[PDB]
Design an enzyme around this catalytic site. Sequence first.
Site, PDB file in Angstrom:
ATOM      1  N   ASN A 149     -33.904  -9.580 -12.850  1.00 10.59           N
ATOM      2  CA  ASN A 149     -34.534  -9.625 -14.178  1.00 10.59           C
ATOM      3  C   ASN A 149     -33.932 -10.737 -15.032  1.00 10.59           C
ATOM      4  OD1 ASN A 149     -36.328  -8.537 -16.346  1.00 10.59           O
ATOM      5  ND2 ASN A 149     -34.352  -8.167 -17.360  1.00 10.59           N
ATOM      6  N   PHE A 150     -32.608 -10.884 -14.948  1.00 10.14           N
ATOM      7  CA  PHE A 150     -31.884 -11.979 -15.610  1.00 10.14           C
ATOM      8  C   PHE A 150     -32.514 -13.346 -15.328  1.00 10.14           C
ATOM      9  CE2 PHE A 150     -29.663 -11.239 -11.556  1.00 10.14           C
ATOM     10  CZ  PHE A 150     -29.555 -12.519 -11.026  1.00 10.14           C
ATOM     11  N   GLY A 151     -32.885 -13.580 -14.067  1.00 12.27           N
ATOM     12  CA  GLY A 151     -33.453 -14.853 -13.617  1.00 12.27           C
ATOM     13  C   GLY A 151     -33.011 -15.146 -12.192  1.00 12.27           C
ATOM     14  N   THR A 152     -32.398 -16.308 -11.967  1.00 17.12           N
ATOM     15  CA  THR A 152     -32.014 -16.723 -10.612  1.00 17.12           C
ATOM     16  C   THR A 152     -30.550 -17.144 -10.497  1.00 17.12           C
ATOM     17  OG1 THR A 152     -32.662 -19.041 -11.008  1.00 17.12           O
ATOM     18  CG2 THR A 152     -34.366 -17.557 -10.179  1.00 17.12           C
ATOM     19  N   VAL A 153     -30.021 -17.101  -9.270  1.00 17.13           N
ATOM     20  CA  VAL A 153     -28.735 -17.719  -8.947  1.00 17.13           C
ATOM     21  C   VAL A 153     -29.059 -18.839  -7.963  1.00 17.13           C
ATOM     22  CG1 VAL A 153     -26.421 -17.508  -7.965  1.00 17.13           C
ATOM     23  CG2 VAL A 153     -27.430 -15.582  -9.224  1.00 17.13           C
TER      24      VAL A 153
ATOM     25  N   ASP B 254     -18.981  -2.176 -12.864  1.00 16.37           N
ATOM     26  CA  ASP B 254     -19.979  -2.378 -11.805  1.00 16.37           C
ATOM     27  C   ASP B 254     -19.329  -2.825 -10.528  1.00 16.37           C
ATOM     28  OD1 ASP B 254     -22.628  -2.247 -10.861  1.00 16.37           O
ATOM     29  OD2 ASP B 254     -23.197  -4.167 -11.683  1.00 16.37           O
TER      30      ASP B 254
ATOM     31  N   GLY C  91     -30.412 -15.940  -4.971  1.00 13.37           N
ATOM     32  CA  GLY C  91     -30.841 -14.598  -5.318  1.00 13.37           C
ATOM     33  C   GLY C  91     -31.604 -14.595  -6.626  1.00 13.37           C
ATOM     34  N   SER C  92     -32.240 -13.461  -6.910  1.00 17.65           N
ATOM     35  CA  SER C  92     -33.090 -13.298  -8.087  1.00 17.65           C
ATOM     36  C   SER C  92     -32.999 -11.881  -8.657  1.00 17.65           C
ATOM     37  CB  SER C  92     -34.547 -13.587  -7.716  1.00 17.65           C
ATOM     38  OG  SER C  92     -34.686 -14.870  -7.131  1.00 17.65           O
TER      39      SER C  92
ATOM     40  N   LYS D 201     -25.982 -19.158 -12.542  1.00 13.45           N
ATOM     41  CA  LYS D 201     -26.802 -18.028 -12.974  1.00 13.45           C
ATOM     42  C   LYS D 201     -27.697 -18.569 -14.074  1.00 13.45           C
ATOM     43  CE  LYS D 201     -26.599 -13.220 -14.571  1.00 13.45           C
ATOM     44  NZ  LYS D 201     -25.725 -12.011 -14.605  1.00 13.45           N
TER      45      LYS D 201
HETATM   46  C1  LIG Z   1     -27.562 -13.193  -0.903  1.00 19.06           C
HETATM   47  O1  LIG Z   1     -26.853 -13.570  -2.095  1.00 19.06           O
HETATM   48  C2  LIG Z   1     -25.970 -14.639  -2.057  1.00 19.06           C
HETATM   49  C3  LIG Z   1     -25.706 -15.360  -0.907  1.00 19.06           C
HETATM   50  C4  LIG Z   1     -24.809 -16.404  -0.912  1.00 19.06           C
HETATM   51  C5  LIG Z   1     -24.174 -16.736  -2.097  1.00 19.06           C
HETATM   52  C6  LIG Z   1     -24.454 -16.003  -3.242  1.00 19.06           C
HETATM   53  O2  LIG Z   1     -23.889 -16.268  -4.472  1.00 19.06           O
HETATM   54  C7  LIG Z   1     -22.687 -17.043  -4.493  1.00 19.06           C
HETATM   55  C8  LIG Z   1     -22.089 -16.852  -5.856  1.00 19.06           C
HETATM   56  C9  LIG Z   1     -22.749 -16.122  -6.833  1.00 19.06           C
HETATM   57  C10 LIG Z   1     -22.191 -15.979  -8.088  1.00 19.06           C
HETATM   58  C11 LIG Z   1     -22.879 -15.203  -9.172  1.00 19.06           C
HETATM   59  C12 LIG Z   1     -20.952 -16.544  -8.312  1.00 19.06           C
HETATM   60  C13 LIG Z   1     -20.350 -17.248  -7.289  1.00 19.06           C
HETATM   61  N1  LIG Z   1     -20.899 -17.420  -6.073  1.00 19.06           N
HETATM   62  C14 LIG Z   1     -25.347 -14.947  -3.252  1.00 19.06           C
HETATM   63  C15 LIG Z   1     -25.599 -14.191  -4.480  1.00 19.06           C
HETATM   64  C16 LIG Z   1     -26.844 -14.219  -5.083  1.00 19.06           C
HETATM   65  C17 LIG Z   1     -27.098 -13.521  -6.243  1.00 19.06           C
HETATM   66  C18 LIG Z   1     -26.115 -12.770  -6.854  1.00 19.06           C
HETATM   67  C19 LIG Z   1     -24.856 -12.719  -6.269  1.00 19.06           C
HETATM   68  C20 LIG Z   1     -24.614 -13.426  -5.097  1.00 19.06           C
HETATM   69  C21 LIG Z   1     -23.740 -11.925  -6.895  1.00 19.06           C
HETATM   70  C22 LIG Z   1     -24.118 -10.454  -6.931  1.00 19.06           C
HETATM   71  N2  LIG Z   1     -24.885 -10.170  -8.143  1.00 19.06           N
HETATM   72  C23 LIG Z   1     -26.298 -10.540  -8.013  1.00 19.06           C
HETATM   73  C24 LIG Z   1     -26.470 -12.051  -8.129  1.00 19.06           C
END
Ligand SMILES: COc1cccc(OCc2cc(C)ccn2)c1-c1ccc2c(c1)CCNCC2
Length: 268
Positions: free
Chosen positions: A19-23, A132, A16-17, A40
């Site tokens: 403003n913070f950046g990416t996961v 939140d 995911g993405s 993150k």
């Molecule tokens: C379609 O999205 C996903 C799909 C699969 C796994 C995901 O993450 C697995 C995760 C994330 C974190 C922060 C900690 C532990 N495990 C995400 C996912 C992508 C972005 C964000 C999240 C979740 C939390 C929600 N806040 C926005 C940021």
Amino acid sequence: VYLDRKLLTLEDKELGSGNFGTVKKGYYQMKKVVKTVAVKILKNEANDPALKDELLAEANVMQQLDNPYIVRMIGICEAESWMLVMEMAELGPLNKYLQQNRHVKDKNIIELVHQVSMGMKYLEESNFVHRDLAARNVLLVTQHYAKISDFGLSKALRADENYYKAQTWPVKWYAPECINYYKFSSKSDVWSFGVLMWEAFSYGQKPYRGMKGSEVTAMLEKGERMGCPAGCPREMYDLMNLCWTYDVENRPGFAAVELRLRNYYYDV
Ligand SMILES: COc1cccc(OCc2cc(C)ccn2)c1-c1ccc2c(c1)CCNCC2
Ligand SMILES: [Br-]
Ligand SMILES: [Br-]
Ligand SMILES: [Br-]
């Protein structure tokens, strides 16, 4: 204290993405096994110390929490970017999961929301306010195991106070006292939990569909509430309405909420 970047391997793709950046998904080398992690990654291109401070404050909250129903932080990694390394909740956000898995049974939904209430009961005991809480921030490890994520708006309450006073939102998840007095408490997280319950029993539908924040506030001030989702047990809808108790003093805390869910799950 900080994690060793050479022990971290990241995938190219983004989970995911924002403003913070990416996961992104990665792997952190432990003593003999490798641990799958969600990372993150802070995109602070302009070197804004505000955004840096925000990630560090999130990390500061997560470091103090230790509960099976809350995402665990492994550590911070100071590398190409600032990175918050967490355990991985592979199945992702609850709202998206239920949107794509409509065969999930009511009993399974009750199990998952009860888990969320156990995590929140722990947060309330620890005197942290989430601020939140929503289905988008509940992540699934398995279809039977949920964890609370996203502590970026969270606040550690002082030893002598019961609420946090803001200076500023996800209005559809906010209690009236949040909107009218800017006061955030474990009781305002309970209101949010009621909205989260509605989302879950609605298989990830958005609450207050099509409405502006101002329209939601007006609806609620008239004593109107969202209705019972299709398939939702009456006892669970009754609990949602109790979470949406207007007067904060008469709204239940998470000890009461978790107990109601626990009893309903095991006795029925
Ligand atoms: C379609 O999205 C996903 C799909 C699969 C796994 C995901 O993450 C697995 C995760 C994330 C974190 C922060 C900690 C532990 N495990 C995400 C996912 C992508 C972005 C964000 C999240 C979740 C939390 C929600 N806040 C926005 C940021
Ligand atoms: Br890498
Ligand atoms: Br959402
Ligand atoms: Br909103």
